[PDB]
């Protein structure tokens, strides 16, 4: 269930994003709802450190950018 997908402390943001949207397809609610969820859930459930940077990428940043920001070093 979607509440359970959270980003690992070394899992890169990309692979976490696949898990998330995989799971999200499985659950059955309105497309509308599943979008709301994303909005709450996906950034919030990233590894604590990674959000730090995400926070600084600005609101405008794309996924593409976030995934880049949040792969390792």
């Amino acid at each position, epitope marked *: 269930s979607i509440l359970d997908i959270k980003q690992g402390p070394k899992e890169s943001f990309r692979d976490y994003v696949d898990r998330f949207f995989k799971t999200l397809r499985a659950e059955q609610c309105t497309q509308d709802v599943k979008n709301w969820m994303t909005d709450t859930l996906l950034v919030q459930n990233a590894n604590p*450190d*990674c959000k730090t*940077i995400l926070r*600084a990428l*600005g609101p*405008g940043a794309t996924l593409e950018e976030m995934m880049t*920001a*949040c792969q390792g*070093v």
Partner: antibody
Amino acid sequence: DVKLVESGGGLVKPGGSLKLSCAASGFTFSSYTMSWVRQTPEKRLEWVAIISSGGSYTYYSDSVKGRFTISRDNAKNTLYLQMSSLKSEDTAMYYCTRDEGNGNYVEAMDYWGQGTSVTVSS
Amino acid sequence: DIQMTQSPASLSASVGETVTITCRASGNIHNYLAWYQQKQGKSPQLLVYNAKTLADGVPSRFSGSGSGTQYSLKINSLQPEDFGSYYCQHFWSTPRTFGGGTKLEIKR
């Protein structure tokens, strides 16, 4: 009383290497996002690189990507900038900078260092 | 990317006058903009952010205003300590870019 103090500026030859650092006193270091910002001889300011409060995540302006490396020793209350492959064009005052703590996204750079100068020339 | 254009490049006023620097983005920023002050040979100080809100310990003569794509900064009745440089930057998209900067000098 928040402080940022950069150092390590100097003269370096084109395609050389130099490492700037910044000692933060004043606040819980590992609680903030940090940046390096430069100012041209002309005085155009250009944001260069940013880093997670944790440290494991970084991000770079195209203009330095793959040439520069940002890092922090949280225990040493220090932020670093590793420069390699120096263009003459990298000649600037380099400023260490703190992202403000309070907005959902970062809404300002809070504080700045005083800067160290780097001149790259032959 | 989003780009910032400022103007004027420079302007010079007299103590007591009022003055408006502007600032213009290649995209919309929904108010995610900040303004820094730079006095000669010092480093920049944050002065305004989110277009409108003043940083702490910034006298009230400073107002920020704007929305969408054009924003601006205004100083009511100048004091000597206000003369310097002024830069805007945005915080919407990922490269936080800076205005060229508006150089403010004193008339006499």
